[PDB]
Amino acid sequence: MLKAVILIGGPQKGTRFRPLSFEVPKPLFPVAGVPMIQHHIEACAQVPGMQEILLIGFYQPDEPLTQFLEAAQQEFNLPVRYLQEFAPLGTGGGLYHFRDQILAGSPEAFFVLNADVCSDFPLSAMLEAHRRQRHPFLLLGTTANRTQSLNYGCIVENPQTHEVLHYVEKPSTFISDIINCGIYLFSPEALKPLRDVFQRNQQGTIRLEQDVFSALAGQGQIYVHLTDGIWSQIKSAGSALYASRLYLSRYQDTHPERLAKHTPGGPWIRGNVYIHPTAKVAPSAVLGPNVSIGKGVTVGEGVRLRESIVLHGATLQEHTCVLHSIVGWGSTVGRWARVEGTPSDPNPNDPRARMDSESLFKDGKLLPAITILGCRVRIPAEVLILNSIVLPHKELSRSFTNQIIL
Amino acid sequence: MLKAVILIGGPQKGTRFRPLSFEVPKPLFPVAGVPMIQHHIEACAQVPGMQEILLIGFYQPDEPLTQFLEAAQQEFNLPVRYLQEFAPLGTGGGLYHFRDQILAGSPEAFFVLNADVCSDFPLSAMLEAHRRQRHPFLLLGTTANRTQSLNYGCIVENPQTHEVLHYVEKPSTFISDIINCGIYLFSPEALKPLRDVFQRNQQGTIRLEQDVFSALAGQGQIYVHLTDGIWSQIKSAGSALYASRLYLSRYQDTHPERLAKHTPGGPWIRGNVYIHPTAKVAPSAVLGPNVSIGKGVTVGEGVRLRESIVLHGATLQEHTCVLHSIVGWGSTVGRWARVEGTPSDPNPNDPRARMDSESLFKDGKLLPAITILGCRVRIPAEVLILNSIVLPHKELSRSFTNQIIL
Amino acid sequence: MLKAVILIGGPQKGTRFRPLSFEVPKPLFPVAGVPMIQHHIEACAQVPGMQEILLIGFYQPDEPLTQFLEAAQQEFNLPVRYLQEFAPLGTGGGLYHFRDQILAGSPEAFFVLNADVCSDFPLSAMLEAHRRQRHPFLLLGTTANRTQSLNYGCIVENPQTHEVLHYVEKPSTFISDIINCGIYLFSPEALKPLRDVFQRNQQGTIRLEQDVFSALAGQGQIYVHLTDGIWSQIKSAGSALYASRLYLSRYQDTHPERLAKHTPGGPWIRGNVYIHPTAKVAPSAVLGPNVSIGKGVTVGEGVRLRESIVLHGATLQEHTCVLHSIVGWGSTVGRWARVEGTPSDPNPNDPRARMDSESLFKDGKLLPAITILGCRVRIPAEVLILNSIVLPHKELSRSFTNQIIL
Amino acid sequence: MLKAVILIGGPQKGTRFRPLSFEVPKPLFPVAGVPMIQHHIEACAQVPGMQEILLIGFYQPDEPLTQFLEAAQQEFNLPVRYLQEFAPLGTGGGLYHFRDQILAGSPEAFFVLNADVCSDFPLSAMLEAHRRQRHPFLLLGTTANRTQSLNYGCIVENPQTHEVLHYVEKPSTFISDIINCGIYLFSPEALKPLRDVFQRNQQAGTIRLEQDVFSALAGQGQIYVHLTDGIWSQIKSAGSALYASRLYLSRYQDTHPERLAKHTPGGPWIRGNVYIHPTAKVAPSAVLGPNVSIGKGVTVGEGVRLRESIVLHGATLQEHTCVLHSIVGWGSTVGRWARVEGTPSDPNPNDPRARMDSESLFKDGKLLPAITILGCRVRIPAEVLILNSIVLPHKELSRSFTNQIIL
Ligand SMILES: Nc1nc2c(ncn2[C@@H]2O[C@H](COP(=O)(O)OP(=O)(O)O[C@H]3O[C@H](CO)[C@@H](O)[C@H](O)[C@@H]3O)[C@@H](O)[C@H]2O)c(=O)[nH]1
Ligand SMILES: Nc1nc2c(ncn2[C@@H]2O[C@H](COP(=O)(O)OP(=O)(O)O[C@H]3O[C@H](CO)[C@@H](O)[C@H](O)[C@@H]3O)[C@@H](O)[C@H]2O)c(=O)[nH]1
Ligand SMILES: Nc1nc2c(ncn2[C@@H]2O[C@H](COP(=O)(O)OP(=O)(O)O[C@H]3O[C@H](CO)[C@@H](O)[C@H](O)[C@@H]3O)[C@@H](O)[C@H]2O)c(=O)[nH]1
Ligand SMILES: Nc1nc2c(ncn2[C@@H]2O[C@H](COP(=O)(O)OP(=O)(O)O[C@H]3O[C@H](CO)[C@@H](O)[C@H](O)[C@@H]3O)[C@@H](O)[C@H]2O)c(=O)[nH]1
Helix, strand or coil, X not given: CEEEXXXXXXXXXXXXXXXXXXXXXXXXXXXXXXXXXXXXXXXXXXXXCEEEEEEEECCCCCHHHXXXXXXXXXXXXCCEEEEECCCCCHHHHHHHHCHHHHCCCXXXXXXXXXXXXXXXXXXXXXXXXXXHHCCCEEEEEEECCCCCHHXXXXXXXXXXXXXXXXXXXXCCCCCCCEEEEEEEEECHHHHHHHHHHHHHHHCCCCCHHHHHHHHHCCCCCEEEEECCCCEEECCCCCHHXXXXXXXXHHHHHHCCCCXXXXXXXXXXXXXXXXXXXXXXXXXXXXXXXXXXXXXXXXECCCCEXXXXXXXXXXXXXXXXXXXXXXXXXXXXXXXXXXXXXXXXXXXXXXXCCCCCCCCCECCCCECCCCEXXXXXXXXXXXXXXXXXXXXXXXXXXXXXXXXXXX | CEEEEEECCCHHHHCCCCCCCCCCXXXXXXXXXXXXXXXHHHHHHCCCCEEEEEEECCCCCCHHHHHXXXXXXXXXXXXXXXXXXXXXXXXCHHHHHCHHHHHCCCCCEEEEEECCEEECCCHHHHHHHHHHHCCCEEEEEEECCCCHHHCCEEEEEECCCCEEEEEEECCCXXXXXXXXXXXXXXXXXXXXXXXXXXXXHHCCCCCHHHHHHCCCCCCCCEEEEECCCCEEECCCHHHHHHHHHHHHHHHHHHCCCCECCCCXXXXXXXXXXXXXXXXXXXXXXXXXXXXXXXXXXXXXXXXEEECCEECCCCEECCCCEEECEEECCCCEECCCCEEECCCCCCCCCCCCCCCCCCCCECCCCECCCCXXXXXXXXXXXXXXXECCEECCCCECXXXXXXXXXX | CEEEEEECCCCCHHHHHHHHHCCCCHHHCEECCEECCHHHHHHHHCCCCEEEEEEEECCCCCHHHHHXXXXXXXXXXXXXXXXXXXXXXXXXXXXXXXXXHHCCCCCCEEEEEECCEEXXXXXXXXXXXXXXXCCCEEXXXXXXXXXXXXCCCEEEECCCCCEEEEEECCCCCCCCCXXXXXXXXXXXXXXXXXXXXXHHCCCCCCCHHHHHHCCCCCCCCEEEEECCCCEEECXXXXXXXXXXXXXXXXXXXXXXXXXXXXXXXXXXXXXXXXXXXXXXXXXXXXXXXXXXXXXXXXXXXXXXXXXXXXXXXXXXXXXXEEECEEEXXXXXECCCCEEECCCCCCCCCCCCCXXXXXXXXXXXXECCCCEEECCCCEECCCCEEXXXXXXXXXXXCCCEECCEEC | CEEEEEECCCCCCCCCCCCCCCCCCHHHCEXXXXXXXXXXXXXXXXXXXEEEEEEECCCCCCHHHHHHHHHHHHHHCCCEEEECCCCCCHHHXXXXXXXXXXXXXXXXXXXXXXXXXXECCCHHHHHHHHHHHCCCEEEEEEXXXXXXXXXXXXXXXXXXXXXXXXXXXCCCCCCCCEEEEEEEEECHHHHHHHHHHHHHHHXXXXXXXXXXXXXXXXXXXXXXXXXXXXXXXXXXXXXXXXXXXXXXXXXXXXXXXXXXXXXXXXXXXXXXXXXXXXXXXXXXXXXXXXXXXXXXXXXXXXXXXXXXXXXXXXXXXXXXXXXXXXXXCCCCEECCCCEEECCCCCCCCCCCCCCCCCXXXXXXXXXXXCXXXXXXXXXXXXXXXXXXXXXXXXXXXXXXXXXXXXX
């Protein structure tokens, strides 16, 4: 018997992902058609013997969250429950504070998953290593580029014994090539170190990486497990496009019916394209690679979309070109209007990619990134939105280039 | 009998050059301690025979606005009402649509005041000139620079009879130096030409400057009353701060009990400083020139505040320096933290410089201006915020420079 | 060219519709599957030459209302605008205040409807009756029971010239059999008497029935039109069920595809039943007469529904019996539960029908009426709810009988 | 060092026997001028060595609750924290789930309080009688009527050793003459039996305190009683809220003699015990009867009679109104010559120990006459009578209603 704990953030952790997030929490953002935590829930429900799934966060319950829970319970034939912390307790304080709800039923091991990561989720292979070793902490890790590894948690391991010799969290200088994926496997004895940290804080927030993983490393408690599958973290609004591309390329092996076929009677389609069944697409339109269409989306007659997410309720009139952009809920694009962005993804393996910054401006000028359109944005006809971020419920009158429209 | 009509805007029409407040309406933004239209309401209540005050604008009636109306009605002992347009009808369209509510009671004349101007309001002088000549339109006029005049509406007049011979609205070329100040006096005959404009629109929305003033100019219907006192327009954040400086310097002649005295036992005050009675300022704090403190603000030990505006409920901890910045309500600044902005101001060599306002991006580069902190923004300890706009409900963790922090 | 003005109420008028008015506004409550003003809009759009439909009411434009406007414009190919009053101006004060928007384009005539009536809407026949006489006010009137006529406004008419000699609004004692149907037809200078009332109020709210109709009665200005078609008014929660019965019986003449077919595969159907296409009904279920089913409704095995409205999102489990009840949005009825009401139709021809007081209690006992279940009300298994009103977001544990659950 | 735990409820678990507060949460409803739990917090401030106050309950945190928390924190010089359960965990499950936050700082004993009781709060006397024997559970208990004790939880006590031998929760038959107050004193080891109950459930983690812990440990030397004679009623419905406001206003003359309004011949006429907020503007022709509370910003007109009422903040009574036995919600307006009346059931006058029972809305399928509730922003027109009636919020009336619930 195993269960899974998905750490979703609160409303403050979603402020980095703020322009898109006003309408819905960051874990309920539709990445490649389905919500972000739904990939985690589905990959946990595909594991044999999963009894329950608990979501630990400090979001207040509203209709999006509980509607998602009521949908996912009947979809995956599993109880999906939401435990709410009273305060922001850190990454590990929420795991320790709900220890009775986690250990209820006495599970043999429980997974712990960050909500922001888009990954392969090879939970079965981690389970087959964990049944071989039966050790308190198992960490999914992956190799990253030497300049990109400084932003993630670095793990120095011994290659023969698969054990964390050392752990440094977001180091200033180079430590190791392997990074922490943010997916862990916990034994039931793994709540015994966390408890000690709680006692040390009184003589009630526990950060899992900086307190548990750093001190426990090298003493035989923490073991690594390396995957070579796809991994990325969704920390910003423009990283959701790259994670959606990763999921749409992953979709061939898992869900071949989700990607749209070419359909020579219907709209021309190149690359991997997800189209929702409710979405009305004109047959004159062509959809380039890595494109997701939401439910109830009307796409006009002659429209080009490439590397773009069109959220649900949005409306694209005819003759428009949308490259590298996220069109929010109910947003309207007038005819002959181009909405462009420049490609930029975390891409830890790659050296060219600009690494994580909360800044967004280099020296008083906006960095080239993914164009975001918030909720209910009315773009007029024959107008260009290039490299630009538009706040919700804003109608534009002329063409904006490289600006944030407040 | 006279009433006065204040043209408060709508939410879309504000389109702030720097957003002084993301969550409160622009006409309720506290300039020099009291809300922006409370200056208009008070200067209108000083005029003899003022029966009523109307506010025309298409804001939806949120409880802050109605609560302000509750306060102002019993403060000035005048009925203050809010008439909401059904749609954005333009500057003069809302006057014509609500002609039955303004004309009821048969006023002798009625004022029309823009909500965004910060002025002397010499309404009695305009009333004396209007009682002398009884002409239908009276316009306040001010003298401006040759470069700065292209932003306002220029007025060419006959200098002897003080009648407008030509009017032009934001011209591309230089026309005249006198600018319209957004303060007018309307005789009851003056709703008759507006009606004429409405019929030409059928062959809804009437722009008062472009359709009434710029068409009837020279035909003996529009007269300009020149004036001398302080005038600025509250378009952006920096112009709001400069208007607050103008009102704090004006307070010496009218409300000497509003400015904080020197008070050697309490906190140090240089220059003109408004401190609310409910705000508790530590006696080691020193508040520089042109500083407004709101209700419930707890300015800590050792704080320096220069050229700032602190909204209600913000807390500043020990040893913090706040220069040229607007602090949103409920915001927390940690100890040794510095919030700085750049005062664009007005030229010191120009004879009549009117302090222009620029919309956030010079030529595709973000320009340095007043630092805006949103509502409930937590600035952490020992950190620097420089030339930044911080969106609400965001807790920072590192120093930011020349950035819009989403 | 004709126009049509529908006086939807405000939030003050929907209070007599409280259980169902907490979630949606009153004019958007679905009567016989479609919203209450959709019947008005479709019967006005079937009239040839109709240009525009205006809705006058002091509701705030919430996203349900604006979403209905956007949907109705593209459904009926007719522009539907919503003109919002600044204050509650009565039945005719809003018609006078928006006179320029109503008379825009010089329409030949414009209908005036009340949003709460449920009727045949024979606007074509009223137009043909209008075009011969060409009089300012054309009133629709029907025959009613002498007991029931004291609740509606009464019209004493001349049989020879079809003219209102006498009008009494809500009479104490009996005056005439004919009652006002709440549908009017207005000629262009019929707004000229209305203006006179405004001037008489200056020594501006205009009640249309008491100030205009009762004053102009007998002066040759008001004319009657007599109808035999179906008519009811929806003033209360239980009146919407009777109006749904009348509209489902009217559907056979106009929209025979909306009624559900008997269906060998489908649930046994007697009488008039509307089922939405998205709704899912088990084959063992049986839906009796006058039953409307909303979208997304899951009806379990062996359910019996008779004279009930099941709004959208509601789930009824197995073997449940529901009679004379209104099931709220997302309200859940557990298995074997019986939700029963007693029929209290308004029915102005019927002599023993109730007076439609808003009292709901006779002498401390709740009168038998329709069983309203609020929005998101969960009913447990094997629990009877008889003649009750359940407020929204409630969860019950035991059987209630003749009670308001607060 | 002590701390105190106040078990405020949640929205659903109340099931208010008369729906007094349609949008203000039940702990924050003002009883005798200040909020209902503030009387707890004030009393918990007077105990020496009191560190913290924890409010455990499953209301979502929003503006009225957190505004009250900030105001009470800066007023009483105490840290007041709100701990929120994820689900309704019941009376003892709240104390078990948040046990790390309760035991932090190692308190020597902690008080547990029901939030709906209006009481004397004799916390220091309980503390002395606890320190003499040092036992895990100490229960405040009072004497009650023989037929009225079936609503409360009854306690069978040994008179010599002051120990419970049998606790029954809301019994049908008669059990004992002593009832549980809802004020408890817990040892640090008092969380040790609670854990046992949690383990017994594993062979939503919800522990009812009174039915599991107290009815299991009874007669084993764990639970002891403390008998008091001071004032006690439980604020379950609206009528008991008026009676609790009366008890607190009569008790105010010892603790807070400055809160009751004086007779003040220059100001309004006052008989009985009246609380008047400083912001409230009352004309001098108004005469305010006994047991009347006035919230902040209330403008009471000329000639207004107010008897046995509670007027929440921002209400407006125009001239010549008469308001008896009713609760006027916040922001609501009553026009001139309008009479708003109710009927107070009270306690039996003959019975020697009679407490107010909070009857439900319906006696026998019919509405029983009780206190008149006006919701918030209710506009009562001029010259109209509301009698024994409940008006839902944001309603405008035009005629006189009697014995009705107006939706
Ligand atoms: N319950 C709870 N959950 C939280 C909290 N704070 C964050 N979470 C969730 O915890 C996960 C990570 O939290 P972060 O603090 O934002 O860490 P990070 O900057 O994203 O980096 C972590 O994950 C990376 C991979 O995504 C790792 O590479 C890195 O080492 C570290 O583990 C996210 O799902 C976040 O929503 C909290 O206070 N309480
Ligand atoms: N009711 C209503 N009011 C409006 C609307 N649009 C603007 N207002 C209000 O009308 C005032 C001026 O509107 P603008 O159209 O933005 O004028 P401007 O660019 O600011 O310049 C005007 O004022 C200057 C001084 O402030 C003048 O110098 C200039 O001539 C012009 O009149 C502002 O307070 C604005 O809030 C509207 O559609 N409806
Ligand atoms: N815009 C606006 N609409 C209003 C207002 N007040 C009422 N309405 C709308 O006006 C219509 C009737 O208003 P009532 O005042 O409640 O009249 P009534 O009790 O329904 O009786 C009227 O209608 C009956 C049939 O519906 C008639 O039988 C009767 O004669 C009378 O005309 C309803 O659609 C209501 O929503 C208002 O202040 N503003
Ligand atoms: N944290 C939390 N608190 C709760 C919960 N449910 C109720 N409370 C609070 O616990 C207190 C009592 O809970 P009840 O279950 O309603 O008990 P009761 O019917 O009022 O009777 C109790 O109190 C009486 C006197 O107040 C006692 O006579 C009786 O013995 C019993 O203890 C009230 O403050 C209630 O708000 C809950 O699920 N979680």
